Amino acid sequence: AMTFNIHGGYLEAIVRGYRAGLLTIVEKCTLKLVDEYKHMLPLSTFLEYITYGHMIDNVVLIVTGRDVQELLEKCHPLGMFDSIMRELYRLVLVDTPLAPYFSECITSEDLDDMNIEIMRNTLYKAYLEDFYKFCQKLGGATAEIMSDLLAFEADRRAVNITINSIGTELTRDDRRKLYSLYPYGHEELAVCEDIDQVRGVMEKYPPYQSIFSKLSYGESQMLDKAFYEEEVKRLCLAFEQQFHYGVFFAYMRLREQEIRNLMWISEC
Amino acid sequence: TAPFFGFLGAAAALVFSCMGAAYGTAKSGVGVASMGVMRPELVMKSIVPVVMAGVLGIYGLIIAVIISTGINPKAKSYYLFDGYAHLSSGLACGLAGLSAGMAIGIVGDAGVRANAQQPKLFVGMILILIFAEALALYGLIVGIILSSRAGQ
Amino acid sequence: ETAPFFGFLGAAAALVFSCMGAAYGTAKSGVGVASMGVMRPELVMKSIVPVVMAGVLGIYGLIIAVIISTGINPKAKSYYLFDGYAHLSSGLACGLAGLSAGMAIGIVGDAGVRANAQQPKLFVGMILILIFAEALALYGLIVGIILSSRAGQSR
Amino acid sequence: ETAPFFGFLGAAAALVFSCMGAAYGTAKSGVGVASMGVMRPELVMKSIVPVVMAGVLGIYGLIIAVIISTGINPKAKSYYLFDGYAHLSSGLACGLAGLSAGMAIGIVGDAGVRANAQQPKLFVGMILILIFAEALALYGLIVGIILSSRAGQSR
Amino acid sequence: ETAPFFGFLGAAAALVFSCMGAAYGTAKSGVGVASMGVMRPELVMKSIVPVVMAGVLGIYGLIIAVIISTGINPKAKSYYLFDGYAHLSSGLACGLAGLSAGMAIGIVGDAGVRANAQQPKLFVGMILILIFAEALALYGLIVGIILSSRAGQ
Amino acid sequence: ETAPFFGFLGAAAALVFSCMGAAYGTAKSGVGVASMGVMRPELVMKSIVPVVMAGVLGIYGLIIAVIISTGINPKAKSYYLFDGYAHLSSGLACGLAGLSAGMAIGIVGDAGVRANAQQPKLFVGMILILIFAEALALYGLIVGIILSSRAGQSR
Amino acid sequence: ETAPFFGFLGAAAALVFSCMGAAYGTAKSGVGVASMGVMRPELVMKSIVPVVMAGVLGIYGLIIAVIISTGINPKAKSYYLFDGYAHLSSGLACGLAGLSAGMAIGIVGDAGVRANAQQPKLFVGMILILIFAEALALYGLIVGIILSSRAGQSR
Amino acid sequence: ETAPFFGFLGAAAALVFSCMGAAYGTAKSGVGVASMGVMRPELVMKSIVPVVMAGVLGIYGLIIAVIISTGINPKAKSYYLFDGYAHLSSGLACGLAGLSAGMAIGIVGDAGVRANAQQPKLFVGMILILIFAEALALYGLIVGIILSSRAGQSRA
Amino acid sequence: ETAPFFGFLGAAAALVFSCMGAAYGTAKSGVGVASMGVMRPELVMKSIVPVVMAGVLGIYGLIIAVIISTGINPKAKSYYLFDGYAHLSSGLACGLAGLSAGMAIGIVGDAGVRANAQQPKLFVGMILILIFAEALALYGLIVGIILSSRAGQ
Amino acid sequence: GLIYNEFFSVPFEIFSHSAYACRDLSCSEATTVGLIKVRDTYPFGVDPVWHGSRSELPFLNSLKMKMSILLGVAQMNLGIILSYFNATFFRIGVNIWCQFIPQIIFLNSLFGYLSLLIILKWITGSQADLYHVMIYMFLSPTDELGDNQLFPGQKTAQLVLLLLAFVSVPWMLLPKPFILKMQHHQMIHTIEFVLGAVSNTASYLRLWALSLAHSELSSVFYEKVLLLAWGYNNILILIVGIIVFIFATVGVLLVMETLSAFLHALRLHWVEFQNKFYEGDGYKFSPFSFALLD
Amino acid sequence: SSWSRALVKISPYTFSAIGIAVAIGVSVLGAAWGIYITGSSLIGAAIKAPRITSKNLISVIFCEAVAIYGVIVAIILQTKLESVPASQIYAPESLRAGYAIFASGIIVGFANLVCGLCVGIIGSSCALSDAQNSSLFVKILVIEIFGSALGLFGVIVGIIMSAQASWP
């Protein structure tokens, strides 16, 4: 308990103040948040993992090429850092947590990362590796939030697979082999081929019960949006942010959600 | 000669009691500040659990006072039995207070969060905390009984 | 002799360990109760039973300590080393049993409270588990009482 | 003179260690049951077997402790250091066996409660494993009984 | 005079360590057996081989404890320190051997449960590994018996 | 005088250390062979060599301990503290060497199981590594035998 | 006097420490060599040189132990406390030096396996580190022999 | 008469701690050399400087130990109380200095070997840093030589 | 008899604890200053003096050690354990107070180095915090002087 | 409970008046050479004096242990005997005579020496044996000795029983595979039966342990109630003590004790009685007899 | 026996002086730890906004009050010292006075450490709470003042124990 006052107290106070102050306009807000995060530079590993979260997607996008030069336009330092096509993939395998594992898991390069569906599969595998790495750094209450996020991503991928991607070889086995209680009981979603079946599978977790509801919204989207939208709706739990705990990831997630809401506002 | 142990009992009784009292008050206080960030009115009433934790220090302080008063060397011959009894009496009171405060701190910290979420459960949290705080009173009773055995 | 220096130490240790176990149980019980009542305030009253079940260990320890304290009286009889040693053994046994029972009851009650709102059958399951746990505390109290009683002869 | 101290300490240690092992086993079983019974009411009663299976070890430990306490009788025979050493050894063996059995039973019961939601054909295997583990408690009780029987024959 | 205070302690320690090793092995064995039975209930009964073999260590420990208890016969002969110390050492050796064998058997069974679940064709190898592990327990029991046999000064 | 204490302690330490080293080596070998038992069961049969080597090391340690125990014949010749100290040192050395050799062989076999599973051509290298490891146990046994023989030279 | 109570113990500890260090180094080297052979079976035979070089520690320890054992002989001449203390110090120095050399050689060989697997050009050159480690072990053995040579200096 | 035990223990500790420091340095040196391999195999020979430094530290420790052992002459000059305590203190100081120097040399050599690829002309600066670190080994050897006889032969 | 040894040990502890505390505080402040230099180098020297302020604690510890050394002399009086133990206690108290103050000042300076760069108006607040922290060191020095005064019995 | 002569944690009037009477001791203490002289044994239950005496624990413990051993022997014998009936009913092969006979004979003979020794000590009153020297006689595996032996033929009977037990080990393993080969799985029965017999024999002591624990808890509750009623005979104190005693009886005596006893009894029934029968497998046939509608 | 006699023969003046010094040392350490804990949050809040410096200074003052009380207790203990005569170096009065001094010093030090830790944690939370909202500063300050009473109670207990000194 005394370690917080021993070190990291000032950074924690600054992060708490910045989060409390938070609430091309979307691009400007994202740039301001990224600058605030960068200026803040134990917690170093947490910041590295938080950045690597979006850096996995940034590297996946940069893996194209095929109009690859356009990736510089979205070079947001929050996720699109320069430090984080097999020949170039081997070079990019450094300075990232999920990259060494993806080097072997996605050794087929574009063959296993086709832009239609297999690129999404490689992105999901990288996200699973990053989630495993983040969960490895256990010791705080953020483990529950990380597990919830990974479960939401896995369940959304499984729902998308059962909806229409089953014809894209995303079968029941692929619901966990390629599509990133879920780390132990994800087998219940392998047969949830229907919206009613999805609700029944969600009934296995009473907290996840009634989250799907009519499933008209949230679950209607493919990729990782089905159960991820449930996490977005329940993010009010993340809004608690009890003191003397790692809240940098929570602040980053809140800033990202605010940026997304501002983008969704657009022209009213 | 033996009275060194008896004197040490009174110091240990206060030290170990305050050690748990500070730990309980710290955990209870931290949760109160967290609730006070958003819920303005709930935090003011929630300070009772912190006040309850601070009472345990008073109970230990009184127990220490009795032990000190009973160690008068020039009044009566403080044999080894009196020194052993006083040290034993202090040890129970100090240890019990440390445990009792620790539970109150753990319970109180969760209680502040629970009250900030659903105000209805505030009565339930108080009841559990009050029941837990009875252990310190139980330790106080044992301390008085043990200290009373200084007759011979 | 030096027998009281061990007998009173054992008597104090009994209450100390019993209080430590009761606090360890009560902390987990309260955490679980708060976690359960955050979402379902209706079952909060039903979830408070394990707290009292754990707290009963404190009363048992206090009774054992009172018995041990009353069992020593130099003005009545010469408390030989055997009597003090037996009293200390009884106190240590009762305190350790109480601490273990309190820790177990706290863990079980926290788990049950966390699972209380999931299914109403938890209201019976956790009660049964708490009763089975408190059975160990009762057995320890009985053993301590027997040892304290046997401490009275000392040849 | 100091032998009764050793004997009483051995009996107290037996009781305390048996209580601790039983408490650990009961806490593990309670956590497992709370996890399992949320989904289905089957774990409420059909899987409450380890809850009493673990308390059986505590009952055995209490019986051994009572026997050891009854073993000491200074008014009937002036116990030498042999009696104290034998009583302490028997108590330590009984308590350690009880603790080991409690830990093993708790782990196995938690695993079985977790697997309860799986195919129910494994209930027989889980019961067999629990019985095989609990056999250690009976072995320890037998060893303690033999030691107590050999204890009083001191010259 | 103080020899029994060592011999009885050695016997109790032997029993305690044997029980601890048996429990340590049986915990992993039971966890693996439960996992395999959940995965494949068909071979659950036949997978209790390490679980059953775990109790052999406890049986051997109980036998060694009984032998040690029978060794202490003050009426038969005045127990000099040369006998009590030897008995205590034999008990300690038997208990340590039992604990080591139990840990090894637990690790082997934990591996073998998954190995058989993936493919039952490795049951022979698992049994051979378990037998090789139990050879250490047998050697320890034999050594303890031999050491206890030297109580004649 | 008290030399039999030292001799018995040394023999027990030798047996215990040898058993612990053999157990660690066997556990590592089994952990390694668990994968080979499924990846290529045909090569799994030949993969039992490290377990046999660990058993051989344990047997050598037990033989050394048995020789040390057989060297203690108080009725034939009085055991001076010199002989007891020498025997205890020999037992400790043999046990430590056996434990180290067993741990090394276990690690080597754990690596070699996967090494041979990836490529059968590494069996020769694995065998050479195992033989080199067992050479240390052989040297330790020889040193223990020499020390045991020298233990009787006192007067 | 009580000379072998320290001299023989040190003689045993020398071999024990040397064996432990050699075992650790050989285990690390064997893991590295197994990984390299899995990478390429061609280099498995040629990469055993560090494994063999790590074996010199066992030979040095055995020689030191034999010399120390031969250095204790009450029948030839009584050894004082100094005569045993010097032998114990020499054995301890030799054992610690052997352990340090074994650890260093193990780390160096573990690195060198990968170094040779990547660049065959540096494979032969990397043997300088192993040569330096062997020289350190030889220097330690020489120091130990010099210390042990003072066995007959007492009077 | 019990002082020679302490003296022999001190000499043995000197040798053991010097060997431990040398091994700790050489492990990091070899790790750095292997890391620098393949990337720049030409500089393999030039990277052997930390190995030479570790060998020099080991040789210095062995020399100090042999110097201490040369004082084991119980046939004359009765050891008294000084010949044990002084020898033990000198051995302990020499061994601890050797261990510290070995650790520092290993750290510096590993850092230099890792950094040998970037700005290869900085090998001279790396060797200068390594020598400035290894000067502590010579200082410790000098201190041990000073304590080898300052309080040993002046017991009279 | 052993009172001179106790007093010398107390003086040594008084020196060493204060030196260690000052070293830790100075190292933390230097790390903070090095971190802050890359951002606003114009303010590198604006807080270097409070960073090196650990020299104050070092000098206080040296003064305490010198005072303790001065008071020990056989010629003045054959001081008994009542004097040596008192000197050792005074030295230990002064050294512990110095170490605690040094650690607290180091943490406060590590915070203030970033705080002043983030807000130049916070320099006065950082100075006030540093003065409040150094009040503890002043109190410790006063207590050490008072304790050493009575040691000259 | 009527057999145990204990009613609500309190003795009462047995069918006889008093089984044991203090030998003389009109004023002498109970602990004496004369001690208590028994006119006759109380047939309805245990001696009323024994329950409340200081010597209650040893005698009751020995009696409970002997009763548990005898009951376990009887249950094992019944379970083993049921095997022949099951084999005949299902018309099983020669495996019954091949394996069931040695299986039911080896354990029966092994426990027979202990059961017969217990009976003889109870019958012949061989106080030179008691609870302990019986185990002592059973302890020795070697021949000779037998100084404390009470059975006139025990010197040869023990050797004969040991030889029979040794010979029974292969007879329970070979004949079934021999018959299988002749007519052309025993590993499951192999090793398991030998250890399981000892395990089942040991488990019988659970009943004695549970009985002793229940007796101790009841005695503690009765002592607390009596202490409340005697010194605290005041109306409020007496009422509070009565309420506390009622609550304790409801909690421990009524609920916990009964639940533990039921669980232990079920465990014993499955572990040993079911071990020699049932054999598992099968399923519950059920027609569409409007079962859901029922 | 002999070891017990040696243990009972230890000089009580050394133990009394050790306790007296330890009281001040522990009080200073606890006060410094609490001051650092409060100062981290105060500096963070000032970086966020320098408006609440006056409110934050109360926590620092409260933390320094623990050091002030410890210094006062140390001065009292120093006043309690005596000449330690050779004849009564092992007298029962001297042993009792030394034991009482050691107990009082240990109690004062432990209480000061606990109070300092609690005050530091409370102030660290309170500064962040005030940064979140200045309206809650009053309740946080009241809670901190209430928690600061541990040091006062410990000082009172130590002062009460200090009356037991009777060294000739």
From Swiss-Prot, chain B:
Record's keyword terms, sorted: Hydrogen ion transport, Ion transport, Membrane, Transmembrane, Transmembrane helix, Transport, Vacuole
Known function: Proton-conducting pore forming subunit of the membrane integral V0 complex of vacuolar ATPase. V-ATPase is responsible for acidifying a variety of intracellular compartments in eukaryotic cells.
Membrane spanning stretches: 4-24, 47-67, 87-108, 121-146
Tissue expression profile of the protein: Expressed in leaf, root, flower and silique. Expression is lower in roots.
Statement: the UniProt record of this protein carries the keyword Iron-sulfur: no
Broad class of the protein's primary localization: membrane
Lumenal side: 68-86, 147-152
Stated name of the protein: V-type proton ATPase subunit c1
Record's bilayer topology term: Multi-pass membrane protein
GO molecular function terms noted in the UniProt entry: proton-transporting ATPase activity, rotational mechanism
Positions in the Cytoplasmic compartment: 25-46, 109-120
InterPro entries in the record: ATPase_proteolipid_c-like_dom, ATPase_proteolipid_csu, ATPase_proteolipid_su_C_euk, F/V-ATP_Csub_sf
Site residues (Essential for proton translocation), renumbered to this chain: 133
Assembly and oligomerization: V-ATPase is a heteromultimeric enzyme composed of a peripheral catalytic V1 complex (components A to H) attached to an integral membrane V0 proton pore complex (components: a, c, c'', d and e). The proteolipid components c and c'' are present as a hexameric ring that forms the proton-conducting pore.
Keyword Heme: no
Family: Belongs to the V-ATPase proteolipid subunit family.
Gene3D superfamilies in UniProt: lithium bound rotor ring of v- atpase
Record-level GO cellular component terms: proton-transporting V-type ATPase, V0 domain; vacuolar membrane; vacuole
Compartment annotation: Vacuole membrane
From Swiss-Prot, chains E, I:
Record function comment: Proton-conducting pore forming subunit of the membrane integral V0 complex of vacuolar ATPase. V-ATPase is responsible for acidifying a variety of intracellular compartments in eukaryotic cells.
Classification via InterPro entries: ATPase_proteolipid_c-like_dom, ATPase_proteolipid_csu, ATPase_proteolipid_su_C_euk, F/V-ATP_Csub_sf
The protein's name in its UniProt record: V-type proton ATPase subunit c1
Keywords, sorted A to Z: Hydrogen ion transport, Ion transport, Membrane, Transmembrane, Transmembrane helix, Transport, Vacuole
Localization (cell): Vacuole membrane
Main location: membrane
Source organism: Arabidopsis thaliana (Mouse-ear cress)
Gene that encodes it: VHA-c1
Subunit structure comment from the entry: V-ATPase is a heteromultimeric enzyme composed of a peripheral catalytic V1 complex (components A to H) attached to an integral membrane V0 proton pore complex (components: a, c, c'', d and e). The proteolipid components c and c'' are present as a hexameric ring that forms the proton-conducting pore.
Database matches in NCBIfam families: V_ATP_synt_C
A GO molecular-function descriptor: proton-transporting ATPase activity, rotational mechanism
